């Protein structure tokens, strides 16, 4: 059951065509999982203090016996056949325009490099509006564009007993061989291997993505990524795995799929507070045109003190702020 919510919207269980309890206790195991991961989640005067506040069904959503009221935490959530997404109510209309505004919000504020032509490709594909399947697509398209541009291979120094002399003959190991051991060479080789730790992360991210994706567009994109990572060893994606990748000239072109693979993989789903999503927004806005999130710098749209207009639903919004910058400066 896919739940599409804005912040502080309430839809009852009778409103969503699903089950009366399977929609409940799925995300109950997520907002308690959000209570477990609450200390690493960043807040900027959001006034939560959830040491025991989120334990009383007050995590990313309110689990009432009648309805589900959403909170300021925006993002997607996939648990136990129940998909949930919470969007900013700034972008709430009077069906794809609110989601891509939320993509381009955390593209230019959270520091990602989400291309606009990849978001323009999803429009007109008559798909269902889904935060998870958009980020599954953006990970899988950026990974498939990179693997097509070149398969990631690393050089590793291997000391092998080889039946053909490849690379550098290890002389002190070959000299100290008894004469019944002279049917192989002790060599040092620097070989282009494909089973890297970066490719093992990308393989286990494509495996976890087909386990939960529902678009045929993403499934076809991830299936050809699955055949690309065929000879790669399957791993389990720990947080220990994602820190052993260090980005140099060899693999910095695989950084855009990696920051998307880290955003999805590490009950799972990304959530940022919209209070601090607006904090990191305007500090990247005030510095190139030259923070309370309630209705009453604040946000201004067709549904919603310097007001910030939103033409980002589909860069001339900051030109209207010059009339506000003429008084502020």
């Amino acid at each position: 059951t896919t739940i599409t919510l804005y912040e502080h919207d309430e839809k009852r269980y009778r409103d969503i065509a699903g089950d009366k309890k399977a929609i409940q206790d799925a995300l109950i195991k997520l907002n308690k999982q959000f209570k477990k991961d609450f200390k690493k989640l960043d807040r900027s005067e959001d006034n939560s203090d959830t040491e025991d506040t989120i334990d009383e069904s007050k995590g990313v959503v309110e689990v009432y016996a009648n309805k589900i009221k959403a909170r300021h935490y925006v993002g997607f959530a996939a648990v136990d056949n129940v998909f949930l997404q919470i969007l900013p109510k700034v972008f709430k209309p009077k069906t794809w325009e609110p989601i891509l505004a939320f993509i381009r919000m955390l593209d230019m504020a959270y520091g990602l490099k989400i291309k606009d032509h990849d978001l323009a490709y999803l429009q007109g594909r008559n798909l269902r509006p889904n935060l998870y399947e958009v980020f599954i697509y953006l990970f899988a398209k950026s990974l498939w564009s990179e693997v097509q541009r070149g398969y990631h291979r690393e050089y590793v120094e291997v000391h092998r007993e080889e039946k053909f002399l490849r690379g550098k003959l290890l002389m002190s190991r070959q000299i100290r061989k008894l004469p019944h051991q002279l049917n192989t060479f002790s060599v040092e080789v620097h070989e282009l291997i494909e089973d890297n730790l970066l490719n093992r992360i990308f393989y286990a991210s494509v495996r976890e993505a087909l386990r939960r994706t529902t678009w045929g567009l993403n499934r076809k994109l991830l299936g050809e990524l699955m055949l690309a990572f065929d000879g790669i060893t399957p791993i389990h994606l720990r947080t220990e795995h994602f820190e052993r990748v260090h980005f140099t000239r060899l693999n910095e072109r695989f950084r855009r799929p990696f920051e998307l693979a880290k955003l999805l993989f590490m009950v799972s789903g990304f959530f940022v507070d919209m209070n601090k999503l607006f904090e990191r927004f305007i500090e990247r806005v005030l510095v190139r045109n030259l923070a309370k999130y309630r209705e009453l710098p604040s946000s201004s749209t067709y549904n919603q003190a310097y007001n910030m207009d939103y033409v980002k639903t589909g860069f001339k919004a900051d030109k209207n702020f010059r009339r506000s910058l003429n008084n502020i400066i």
Binding site: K163, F164, L165, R166, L182, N183, F185, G231
Partner: peptide, 25 residues
């Protein structure tokens, strides 16, 4: 196959034996 190499296809240093079957490279 995956283990197939340049050395089996074009050329490589390979341990052969003599007619007195002593190993030679």
């Amino acid at each position: 196959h995956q283990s197939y190499s340049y050395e089996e296809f074009i050329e490589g240093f390979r341990p052969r034996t003599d007619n007195e079957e002593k190993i030679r490279y």
